[PDB]
Amino acid sequence: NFNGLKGTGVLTESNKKFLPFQQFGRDIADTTDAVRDPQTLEILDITPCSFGGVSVITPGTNTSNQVAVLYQGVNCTEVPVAIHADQLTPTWRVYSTGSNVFQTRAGCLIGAEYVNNSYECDIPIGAGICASYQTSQSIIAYTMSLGAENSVAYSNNSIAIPTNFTISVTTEILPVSMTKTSV
Amino acid sequence: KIQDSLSSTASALGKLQDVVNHNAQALNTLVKQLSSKFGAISSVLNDIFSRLDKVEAEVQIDRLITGRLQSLQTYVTQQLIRAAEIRASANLAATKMSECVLGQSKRVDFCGKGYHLMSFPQSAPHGVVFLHVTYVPAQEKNFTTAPAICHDGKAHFPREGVFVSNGTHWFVTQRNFYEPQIITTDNTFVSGNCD
Amino acid sequence: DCTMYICGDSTECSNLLLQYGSFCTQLKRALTGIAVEQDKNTQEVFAQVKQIYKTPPIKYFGGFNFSQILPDPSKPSKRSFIEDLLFNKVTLLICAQKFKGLTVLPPLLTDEMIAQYTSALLAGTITSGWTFGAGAALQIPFAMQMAYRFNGIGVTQNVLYENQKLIANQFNSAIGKIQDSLSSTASALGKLQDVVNHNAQALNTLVKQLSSKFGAISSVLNDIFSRLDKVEAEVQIDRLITGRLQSLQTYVTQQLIRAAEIRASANLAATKMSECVLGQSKRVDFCGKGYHLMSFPQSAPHGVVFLHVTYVPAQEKNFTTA
Numbered sequence A: 001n002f003n004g005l006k007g008t009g010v011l012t013e014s015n016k017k018f019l020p021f022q023q024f025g026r027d028i029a030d031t032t033d034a035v036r037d038p039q040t041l042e043i044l045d046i047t048p049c050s051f052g053g054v055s056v057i058t059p060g061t062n063t064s065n066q067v068a069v070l071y072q073g074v075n076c077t078e079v080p081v082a083i084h085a086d087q088l089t090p091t092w093r094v095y096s097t098g099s100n101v102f103q104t105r106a107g108c109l110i111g112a113e114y115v116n117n118s119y120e121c122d123i124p125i126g127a128g129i130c131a132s133y134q135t136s137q138s139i140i141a142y143t144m145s146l147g148a149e150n151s152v153a154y155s156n157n158s159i160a161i162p163t164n165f166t167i168s169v170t171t172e173i174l175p176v177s178m179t180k181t182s183v
Numbered sequence B: 001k002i003q004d005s006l007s008s009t010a011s012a013l014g015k016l017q018d019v020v021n022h023n024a025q026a027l028n029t030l031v032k033q034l035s036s037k038f039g040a041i042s043s044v045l046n047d048i049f050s051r052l053d054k055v056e057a058e059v060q061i062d063r064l065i066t067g068r069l070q071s072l073q074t075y076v077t078q079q080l081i082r083a084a085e086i087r088a089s090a091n092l093a094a095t096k097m098s099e100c101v102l103g104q105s106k107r108v109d110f111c112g113k114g115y116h117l118m119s120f121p122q123s124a125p126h127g128v129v130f131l132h133v134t135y136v137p138a139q140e141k142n143f144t145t146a147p148a149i150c151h152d153g154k155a156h157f158p159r160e161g162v163f164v165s166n167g168t169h170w171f172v173t174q175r176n177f178y179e180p181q182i183i184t185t186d187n188t189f190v191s192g193n194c195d
Numbered sequence C: 001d002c003t004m005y006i007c008g009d010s011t012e013c014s015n016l017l018l019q020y021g022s023f024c025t026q027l028k029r030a031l032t033g034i035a036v037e038q039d040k041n042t043q044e045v046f047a048q049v050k051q052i053y054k055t056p057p058i059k060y061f062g063g064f065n066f067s068q069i070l071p072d073p074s075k076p077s078k079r080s081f082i083e084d085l086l087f088n089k090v091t092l093l094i095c096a097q098k099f100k101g102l103t104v105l106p107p108l109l110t111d112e113m114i115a116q117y118t119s120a121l122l123a124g125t126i127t128s129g130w131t132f133g134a135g136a137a138l139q140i141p142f143a144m145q146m147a148y149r150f151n152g153i154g155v156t157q158n159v160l161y162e163n164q165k166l167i168a169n170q171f172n173s174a175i176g177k178i179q180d181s182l183s184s185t186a187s188a189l190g191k192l193q194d195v196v197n198h199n200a201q202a203l204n205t206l207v208k209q210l211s212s213k214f215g216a217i218s219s220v221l222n223d224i225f226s227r228l229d230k231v232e233a234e235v236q237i238d239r240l241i242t243g244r245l246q247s248l249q250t251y252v253t254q255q256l257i258r259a260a261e262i263r264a265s266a267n268l269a270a271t272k273m274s275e276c277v278l279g280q281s282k283r284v285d286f287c288g289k290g291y292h293l294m295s296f297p298q299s300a301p302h303g304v305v306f307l308h309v310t311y312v313p314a315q316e317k318n319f320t321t322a
């Protein structure tokens, strides 16, 4: 509550320079981010507390009940610091000190063991990560698989011609209209 | 096989399912949204009249009429977006019916995965389902080729087809089915010398 | 997010926001549909192959030179020479948006495999021809594939082999100017800059909007309760709440529009790749200016850039006909 400037967050050392006149620093978002302590001329650095979107990775509810959790846009070493009673809105703080964690560009997901083999995507994550319920049975997040590679034996005197043909019926579905409604 | 494929899993009809789901889900929100008090004292009109003076009951109602009317407006706008999306799907469906069904289209990957032969439309609830019939080349054998051929000191070309040989002597065949033929002047036109 | 964008760090504000019900719970539903869609467009544009082909080590295609479009192993990232110019010319604080609850999720298909799919599409159209867009990939000599595209144009294939070296040198000089032309002006990539600009510009209004008064005593959330009595504070705070809530509604209903103008472009590109790249098309002036030989795709940030190779008649001699 610096001079009545109510706010919440964590304050660190700020390398930004204030002129002796200037008191409050403002960002592009037009809000305070740095304050000058009345007792100590050193400039603080206001930034909001640790937060972010909470994503749950779940298979079919009937299939299983383990649900790995992915944390959005946070360093994976920060959420262990966040663990404290009356300090975290979720009461399920067990996963923060939970199973083996894997860190990606979309934060680190907890409750799923990263397997370094390749599988086709079942549940999208982002940045080439796809969690799935595989083999006892748990949740594993792997890297995106683009399909098995297939070299072509190209040669400047070689040609390949199909000696046989097959007819396969392919389906395709398109909506044409929704329900007419009135209010 | 198509009979079993569609009925094997419920995810085959996914495109049609959310069209009737999003509509049936937006209505639920609209019905639920009238329960909101919208900052007023209550959420039912009759109690506002029965318990508040008409000089200031309008102010409480003002936050309710404007709140409900605006909430109704966002539902209509959420419908024009979908109407502009289905219209972009009906026209694509209309193009499929015009080209894939009523005729044959040489456009690759437009009426099936591969060469297109024909189609059969099928009626669907709030949509249409097509049955593309495709020609797909089967197992193949590679051969040794040559762009041209010289017989009388003069270049020779395939009139339509490609030149192939199994190792001993050459043959001309179609592009999509190995049907070798003896090289003949009828399948060949000369163009200049072979140097 | 709902609570912290409207009533952040204020338990005396988020409590009364529930009085509006699921009004902004529908906001997350709307912006989730656009989110998953941007991971669906890229799935149906760059991924029309079930195999990941690799070009042979030698790059001598009968006089044709493709070093400007094949992936470059020398660079640590598998990106083609043309790809490098596109990425540099496309330019994406960013942290301040996050602190207001405006996250930027990363796409499912990361940029590395996007240039890997494009490597596959450049590994079939130069070795296997257009037959790998219809089934089993079959190799043909690239000296012959011109005689097939030329056959569909209308000219007999004899004009090719009599003029192969002339064409290859003509092609080699043609692909080189694309490197110069793309970097010549920054307005060439204008159709991609505005896409990231409009998205970036829209967020600027949103963060600046929450500092507006909306007719209230003060735009600051906390000082309203700390300076005015509670009898009219709820009325006072209501028009501040509806100001931010309505502003979020305006942004989302405009963002859906921009999705539609992109969803339309995604389908156009998907047809372009299915026709202009995976084959030769008879749709005049649909895959470039002039008769169409083939096409080569190249990835780009938040977009795709094609390289149509069109056939244009040169000078002519008028004749007398019957």
Ligand SMILES: *[C@@H]1O[C@H](CO)[C@@H](O[C@@H]2O[C@H](CO)[C@@H](O[C@@H]3O[C@H](CO)[C@@H](O)[C@H](O)[C@@H]3O)[C@H](O)[C@H]2NC(C)=O)[C@H](O)[C@H]1NC(C)=O
Binding pocket: B166, B167, B168, B169
């Ligand atoms: C590549 O294709 C050519 C064309 O079919 C093959 O040449 C032909 O081969 C068959 C048997 O493989 C020959 O038939 C036999 O000919 C002998 C000749 O004395 C005859 O006594 C037998 O009763 C039988 O009819 C056929 O004559 C021959 N074509 C010619 C013009 O001589 C060739 O064998 C194939 N090579 C490979 C490696 O597949």
Ligand SMILES: *[C@@H]1O[C@H](CO)[C@@H](O[C@@H]2O[C@H](CO)[C@@H](O)[C@H](O)[C@H]2NC(C)=O)[C@H](O)[C@H]1NC(C)=O
Binding pocket: C059, C060, C065, C066, C067, C068
């Ligand atoms: C295909 O074109 C590229 C582009 O010019 C060629 O790369 C050149 O290789 C020579 C070889 O000494 C170098 O001096 C040039 O500096 C290279 N160009 C660039 C832009 O770096 C490549 O050699 C060509 N390939 C074939 C087979 O002709």
Ligand SMILES: *[C@@H]1O[C@H](CO)[C@@H](O[C@@H]2O[C@H](CO)[C@@H](O)[C@H](O)[C@H]2NC(C)=O)[C@H](O)[C@H]1NC(C)=O
Binding pocket: C166, C169, C170, C314
């Ligand atoms: C057709 O046009 C091409 C180029 O558009 C001509 O090729 C050029 O010919 C001149 C003179 O013979 C040479 O100096 C150039 O080096 C050639 N260019 C290339 C890329 O090789 C060609 O001569 C023209 N043919 C006719 C019959 O007019």
Ligand SMILES: *[C@@H]1O[C@H](CO)[C@@H](O)[C@H](O)[C@H]1NC(C)=O
Binding pocket: A060, A061, A062, A063
């Ligand atoms: C339960 O979930 C499974 C998914 O493994 C599904 O196959 C099954 O139909 C579900 N049963 C229900 C929803 O009754």
Ligand SMILES: *[C@@H]1O[C@H](CO)[C@@H](O)[C@H](O)[C@H]1NC(C)=O
Binding pocket: A074, A075, A076, A077, A103, A104, A107, A108
């Ligand atoms: C956390 O920050 C450190 C900074 O040194 C960085 O090295 C690390 O990769 C970050 N981890 C995550 C999960 O963001």
Ligand SMILES: *[C@@H]1O[C@H](CO)[C@@H](O)[C@H](O)[C@H]1NC(C)=O
Binding pocket: A115, A116, A117
């Ligand atoms: C891949 O995973 C296996 C088992 O999970 C492990 O033994 C191996 O060391 C891993 N490889 C790398 C390169 O980390």
Ligand SMILES: *[C@@H]1O[C@H](CO)[C@@H](O)[C@H](O)[C@H]1NC(C)=O
Binding pocket: A156, A157, C058, C060
């Ligand atoms: C095929 O390419 C190689 C690579 O340069 C070349 O040595 C060979 O002569 C070519 N084939 C023919 C038939 O010219």
